[PDB]
Each structure stands twice: as structure tokens, then as C-alpha cells.
């Protein structure tokens, strides 16, 4: 009953677009947690991935890292992008993903140091999960993180590592999917 402390404190954000708000003004921090117990409470008290309306997104980031490219810990970084398929349960994907992150179930300390946060993006065209990392060029560490994600999420399809520069320049609507790294 004494709470179980986590390696990191994390903050949980909902992105909800409304006209006449800038991208970053569409984000709102709905919780900060630092224990296993408060982690699960957050997920029990917020919308399930399978229930969310399209275009309303979930961001979970280490608390001192803002969920935006502009953050120092993000600007020189990149994401592992996961393209969700029709057969996949997004609750399972999200829960497994957040468990991996909050429990810090990486083999090495350095892998945990790379982690910024995770993003769930429900889309009619095909939903996306991402893990944002602090660098775009720590090849070995980035690749072992990508491998661990695929294991935990039981992923079959190729996942893509995309530096922030490529995410920014990416035109909405484009059907091209590529990465600096792939596994």
C-alpha cells in the first residue's frame, strides 16, 4: 500500500484541435504521475485508445520534457513510428508501450536516457504510435530500443525511425513512409 516509485515522473497530455488555436495551444496537461499506482489511475480515469475520436491524440512524456519538437530534449531527436493495422488492439498496444516506458524495462540505463515519451494518434487513414527519442544518431542505442518496442508490442510490420527534421518537413496527406533506420 506504500506507493511504488517510478524511475521517472511522467506527464499525460490530450491533444484536441479547435479552430483558432495554434498547434501547441491544442495540448493540455491532464496529469502528472510518479508511482505505479498513479500511472494506472491516470489510464483508468482517461479515455481508452479504442474509444477516442479521430485526430484527438495522447502524449506521455517525462515531466520536464514538453510534448513538442521545440523542447531541447526533442529538437535534435527522432521517433520510432508504428503503423497500426486493422487486426491490432490499440488498447493493448498503448498499455504495453506505456508499461515498457514507465517501468523502464530496457536492458541498459543509456536506453532509458534516450526516452522522451510516447504518442498515440488515432486516424481514419491508419492510426499511429510513436516513441520519441532524444537523439537521431545514437545508432546502436536507437536500434536496441526499436527492437525492444517490437518485442513488447508483438509487432510484425516494419517500424520507422524518423528524425525531427523529417517529421517537420513531412507534408500532411503524403503516403510516403520511410525512416533513417528501419526494423
Amino acid at each position: 500500500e506504500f506507493p511504488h516509485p517510478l524511475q521517472d515522473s511522467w506527464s499525460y497530455y490530450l491533444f484536441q484541435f479547435r479552430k483558432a488555436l495554434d498547434w501547441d495551444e491544442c495540448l493540455e496537461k491532464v496529469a502528472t504521475f510518479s508511482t505505479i499506482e498513479d500511472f494506472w489511475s491516470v489510464l483508468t480515469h482517461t479515455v481508452r485508445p479504442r474509444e477516442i475520436t479521430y485526430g484527438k491524440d495522447l502524449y506521455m512524456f517525462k515531466s520536464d520534457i514538453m510534448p513538442k519538437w521545440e523542447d531541447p530534449k526533442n529538437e535534435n531527436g527522432g521517433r520510432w513510428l508504428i503503423n497500426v493495422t486493422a487486426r491490432q488492439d490499440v488498447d493493448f498496444l498503448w498499455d504495453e508501450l506505456l508499461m515498457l516506458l514507465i517501468g523502464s524495462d530496457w536492458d541498459t540505463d543509456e536506453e532509458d536516457r534516450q526516452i522522451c515519451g510516447a504518442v498515440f494518434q488515432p486516424r481514419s487513414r491508419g492510426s499511429k504510435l510513436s516513441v520519441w527519442l532524444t537523439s537521431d544518431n545514437e545508432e546502436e542505442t536507437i536500434l536496441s530500443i526499436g527492437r525492444r518496442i517490437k518485442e513488447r508490442l508483438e509487432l510484425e510490420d516494419t517500424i520507422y525511425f524518423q528524425p525531427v527534421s523529417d517529421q517537420r518537413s513531412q507534408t500532411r496527406g503524403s503516403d510516403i513512409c520511410t525512416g533513417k533506420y528501419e526494423i
Binding site: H4, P5, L6, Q7, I36, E37, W40, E96, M99, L100, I102, G103, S104, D105, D109, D112, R152
Partner: peptide, 15 residues
């Protein structure tokens, strides 16, 4: 240092 919890433990804490 690093505080680590596996999914088995995390899920036992949940359910």
C-alpha cells in the same frame, strides 16, 4: 539506480 518493473509486476499492481 535505475528503477525497473516488468509487465508481470505492473499488471499485478493493476488487477
Amino acid at each position: 539506480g535505475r528503477i525497473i518493473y516488468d509487465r508481470k509486476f505492473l499488471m499485478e499492481c493493476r488487477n
